Design a protein around this ligand. Structure first.
Ligand SMILES: CN(C)Cc1ccc(C(=O)Nc2cc(Cl)cc(C(=O)NC(C)(C)CO)c2)[nH]1
Ligand code: NA
Lengths: 38, 153
C-alpha cells in the first residue's frame, strides 16, 4: 500500500483568521469525468 | 481514526510527496477521488479501504458512507482549513463566489494553493464541514477557483 495519512490539525473555526480571496460568479460545465470548465 | 484533518502522502515518487488532504469524522475518512484514485490507505499499522466513490463528484469515503452533510448558507463567510505541502495547517476566511451550472448553483472559493492541498475542508461558523476544496478551474489570471464539493449523507 503506497499511500498513508498523517494528522495535520483539529477542525475548528479560528476567530480572527486572515480574511482574503474574491467571490466570482462564474458560468461552468461539469463533464462526466468530473472536470469543471468556464 | 481520531476526528481531524489529515495529509495524504505517497512514497512512490521522490521522497515523501503530499498528494492531498482529507477529513476523519465519525470513523470515516473523506477525500477527493483524484487524490487517491480509490486506492487503499495506510494509517499507522491500520489499513483504510474505500467504501463509496464517484469520479463525477470527485469524492471518496473510507471505512463507511459519506458523513459530511452541512451546507453553505449562501450568505456568510467560511474558512478554508488549508493544509499545504510541507507547511502547517492554516485557516483562511473568505466569502465564496458561485459556480452557475445547468443543474444549479454551488459555492466557490477563490484561493491559490498547490494541487497537493486538494481535499482541505471548508468550515461554517459552527466548525461544521460544508465541503472539500480542490476540484475547480484555472481562470484568466492563472489563479484557481474551487467548487465547494459536498457529498450526500
Ligand atoms: C477531478 N479531476 C477529474 C479534475 C481535476 C484535475 C485537477 C483538478 C484540480 O482542481 N486541481 C487543483 C487543485 C488545487 Cl487545490 C489547486 C490547483 C492549482 O493549480 N493551484 C494553483 C493556485 C494554480 C497553484 O498551482 C489545481 N481537478
Ligand atoms: Na485503484
Amino acid at each position: 500500500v503506497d499511500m498513508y495519512i498523517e494528522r495535520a490539525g483539529d477542525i475548528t473555526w479560528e476567530k480572527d483568521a486572515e480574511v482574503t480571496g474574491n467571490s466570482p460568479r462564474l458560468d461552468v460545465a461539469l463533464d462526466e469525468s468530473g472536470d469543471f470548465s468556464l
